[PDB]
Amino acid sequence: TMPRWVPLLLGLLGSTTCGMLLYAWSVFIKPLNAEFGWSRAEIAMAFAICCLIFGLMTFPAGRLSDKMGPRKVVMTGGVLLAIGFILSGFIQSKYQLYITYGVIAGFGGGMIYLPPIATAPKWWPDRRALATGFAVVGLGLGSFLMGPLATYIIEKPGMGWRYVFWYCGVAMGIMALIAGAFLEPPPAGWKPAGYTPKVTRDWTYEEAKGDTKFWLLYLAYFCGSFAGLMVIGHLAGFGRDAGLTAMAAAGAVSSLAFSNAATRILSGWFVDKIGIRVYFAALFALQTAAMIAIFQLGGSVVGLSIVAIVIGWNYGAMFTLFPATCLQFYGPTAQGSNYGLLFTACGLAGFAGPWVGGWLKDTTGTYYLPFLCAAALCALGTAIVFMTKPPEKKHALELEVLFQ
Numbered sequence: 001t002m003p004r005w006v007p008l009l010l011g012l013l014g015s016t017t018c019g020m021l022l023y024a025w026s027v028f029i030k031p032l033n034a035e036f037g038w039s040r041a042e043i044a045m046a047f048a049i050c051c052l053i054f055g056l057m058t059f060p061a062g063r064l065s066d067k068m069g070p071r072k073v074v075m076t077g078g079v080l081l082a083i084g085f086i087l088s089g090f091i092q093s094k095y096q097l098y099i100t101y102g103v104i105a106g107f108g109g110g111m112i113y114l115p116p117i118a119t120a121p122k123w124w125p126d127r128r129a130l131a132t133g134f135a136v137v138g139l140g141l142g143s144f145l146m147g148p149l150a151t152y153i154i155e156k157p158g159m160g161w162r163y164v165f166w167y168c169g170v171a172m173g174i175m176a177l178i179a180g181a182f183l184e185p186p187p188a189g190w191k192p193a194g195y196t197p198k199v200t201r202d203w204t205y206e207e208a209k210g211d212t213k214f215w216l217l218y219l220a221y222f223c224g225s226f227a228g229l230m231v232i233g234h235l236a237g238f239g240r241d242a243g244l245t246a247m248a249a250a251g252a253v254s255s256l257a258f259s260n261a262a263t264r265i266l267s268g269w270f271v272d273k274i275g276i277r278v279y280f281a282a283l284f285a286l287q288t289a290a291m292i293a294i295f296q297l298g299g300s301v302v303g304l305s306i307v308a309i310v311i312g313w314n315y316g317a318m319f320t321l322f323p324a325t326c327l328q329f330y331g332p333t334a335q336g337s338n339y340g341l342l343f344t345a346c347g348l349a350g351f352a353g354p355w356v357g358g359w360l361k362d363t364t365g366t367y368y369l370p371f372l373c374a375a376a377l378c379a380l381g382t383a384i385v386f387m388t389k390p391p392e393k394k395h396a397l398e399l400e401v402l403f404q
């Protein structure tokens with residue numbers, strides 16, 4: 001039936017829509033402050049709520065994708081996201097924005113984001129991590145797609161920021177319905193392949209949810225996620241505090257988008273070829289080193305760029321290597337449920353990380369505390385990821401007894 005790269009194209013579409021949704025809030029920081037007495041932090045609360053609900057709703061989304069297939073889940077997510085974004089177009093208050101953009105749109109975003117991450121590797125057992133990366137690279141691309149689009153709509157005279165919400169919400173609803181329309185696992189028996197009595201079987205959601213290694217991974221995820229979200233918003237300010245012009249710090253930090261996008265594909269390909277654990281742990285360790293190294297490199301465009309690129313490489317790689325690692329531990333059958341649960345760690349990190357980083361800076365007045373804490377979190381993640389080897393594969397005695 002369908003060529004097994006169509007799933008990859010679909011995951012590219014849906015994750016790109018999710019990246020657009022998660023990028024929009026910065027687009028509206030300044031227009032909403034112009035129209036209302038609304039602080040940057042007041043608008044950032046809408047983004048933090050969005051991250052909380054998105055990361056949380058991956059769990060029901062994965063359970064439902066497993067139970068009734070990914071197509072219904074992704075197209076419902078497209079509906080919810082379209083509704084919440086378009087209604088953000090018609091808002092008048094902060095709580096209306098929190099509800100429409102934060103809760104509704106984030107709900108739809110989690111339901112769009114997860115099912116392709118569980119489905120694409122099913123079409124690609126020879127290349128599971130690369131398939132996963134295609135399911136997530138859209139979160140690195142959504143900024144580049146929306147930035148010019150949202151600027152274009154806002155500055156046009158007959159339009160406005162509410163017009164960004166309305167038009168971009170229709171467009172994202174369409175992309176997500178098109179992505180979810182054509183998404184389904186391979187058929188129940190024959191596996192698309194040219195190549196390939198004890199009997200193993202994949203883990204069940206209840207079996208993985210009870211494994212201690214699942215929760216070590218959850219902890220590592222929370223740590224790496226939290227560290228990145230705590231400092232990335234501070235890189236450019238670190239530069240200007242070091243003496244760079246705002247323009248120069250902004251240019252340097254911008255390389256983070258490129259590496260954040262590239263690592264999602266490239267790291268998938270690498271670990272498909274050489275295994276996950278060692279490359280994975282090395283990325284966390286390098287992330288630890290970068291949190292420290294910024295105090296020596298962050299004062300020049302070249303140094304700040306190196307730190308930004310490295311941070312982006314390690315951060316973005318987490319969202320391919322945690323689903324790939326989970327796939328290796330527990331198998332693809334319950335990957336929807338297993339990884340949906342696991343991503344809630346990111347839901348929580350997304351809610352709290354940026355705020356806590358800002359608070360540590362403003363409490364001390366310096367960057368030492370947030371970056372030092374991020375380094376410690378990444379050191380812990382390094383330890384966990386490096387020490388944690390796959391659990392024992394499961395004997396399936398019910399299948400096993402079928403042999404006379």
Ligand SMILES: Cc1ccccc1CCC(=O)O
Pocket residue numbers: 022050051052054055136139140225319346347349350
């Ligand atoms: C880190 C995070 C938290 C909550 C919701 C979304 C995301 C982004 C995930 C990605 O970059 O792939």
